[PDB]
Ligand SMILES: Cc1cc2nc3c(=O)[nH]c(=O)nc-3n(C[C@H](O)[C@H](O)[C@H](O)COP(=O)(O)O)c2cc1C
């Protein structure tokens with residue numbers, strides 16, 4: 001759109017999409033894309049009905065990307081029975097998308113403890129009182145209970161349901177606007193020995 | 203905290219619980235237009251394959267209908283193939299400037315070809331050549347060949363026939379959520395689910 005949007009990988013077909021992912025994200029940070037790690041994450045229920053919401057990617061790992069949430073949320077309950085998920089990053093400023101597909105696996109509690117402690121302590125009170133995605137019966141009661149905890153010197157204990165998922169990637173697509181509406185689509189699929197890569201028609 | 207929004211985003215509906223969620227959708231979209239949100243109708247649309255594995259991509263909401271939202275695509279694309287077997291979908295709008303999300307869940311129905319003809323004609327004609335030559339989401343074997351083919355069609359400098367497979371879907375909504383940042387991190391989540399008659403409305407915990 002409004003900012004420079006280089007996509008040399010569409011020509012060169014790099015072998016490792018995780019390198020491409022790292023490079024796109026680092027560039028997004030450098031050029032000042034607004035909230036580049038806001039991932040629209042899709043899960044599905046036992047009938048195959050998708051649900052979506054934004055989550056923040058907290059880190060990139062060897063196998064994929066990592067985010068935190070509550071296990072009893074809708075996404076948590078869906079992932080418990082159906083680990084397959086997909087997320088899209090969309091950067092308006094550069095007209096670029098990254099699509100991330102794979103299986104999300106809940107990481108151990110020590111990882112969750114560390115993630116919880118790395119959040120700003122001001123987030124701990126509400127995340128402790130709320131049972132994410134359950135019906136809220138009394139707004140003021142929640143507000144007041146969190147205010148009681150906000151008086152404390154953080155950090156608070158990690159709540160039982162606070163968890164970290166790693167989305168272990170099986171495929172990725174990098175999308176750019178291209179020239180003459182020939183949008184540039186670079187698609188990776190995991191193989192037994194590495195990754196296959198192809199271009200897709202726009 | 204990753205949230206960067208700083209624009210006031212009134213959410214009286216979280217207090218008043220309107221019976222009819224499409225009015226809330228209209229209110230929020232109209233405000234987004236008035237305050238200048240960038241691409242508010244860029245919808246991250248999720249579909250699922252035959253085994254329930256999701257896929258996602260951005261599409262644009264072209265219209266708000268009585269039942270839901272409308273978008274166009276190619277029937278042979280991944281999303282089109284997925285929807286034709288499993289009509290259930292979900293999409294999310296996220297507006298950074300106001301820290302608002304809208305989650306839209308329902309069943310997508312392919313509209314008649316007359317509707318697709320009209321939508322096709324409403325697109326700028328400069329978009330017609332590439333959309334005609336491209337079989338969306340199939341492997342692209344020769345970039346230059348596609349480029350050259352589209353350039354030849356573009357010489358017409360006018361509208362082309364609607365391609366087989368260019369289609370319009372209406373996502374007929376079964377549930378919605380309106381999410382606002384709220385105060386003191388008590389994010390404001392207003393959730394609607396269709397009932398036998400009308401809608402049920404609830405607040406959700408953040
Ligand atoms: C910009 C943004 C970032 C968010 N990041 C997270 C996150 O990382 N983890 C989380 O659980 N919820 C996050 N949320 C809240 C989710 O969108 C959602 O409301 C919540 O996770 C419940 O989703 P569910 O009911 O579909 O499970 C974020 C919301 C916004 C607007």
Ligand SMILES: Cc1cc2nc3c(=O)[nH]c(=O)nc-3n(C[C@H](O)[C@H](O)[C@H](O)COP(=O)(O)O)c2cc1C
Nearest residue numbers: 244258259260261262274275276279280281282339
């Ligand atoms: C801002 C933006 C808007 C888009 N709008 C549409 C659209 O309305 N319809 C469409 O078919 N593809 C649209 N695309 C392209 C899709 O994201 C996607 O690449 C294409 O539809 C193929 O998706 P699929 O392979 O998952 O079916 C848009 C892409 C961007 C970046």
Ligand SMILES: O=C(O)[C@@H]1CC=CC2=Nc3ccccc3N[C@H]21
Nearest residue numbers: 056068069070127203204205389
């Ligand atoms: O950037 C952030 O902190 C996110 C902004 C809005 C809501 C969030 N909810 C979370 C819930 C659990 C774990 C992380 C979250 N991130 C924030």
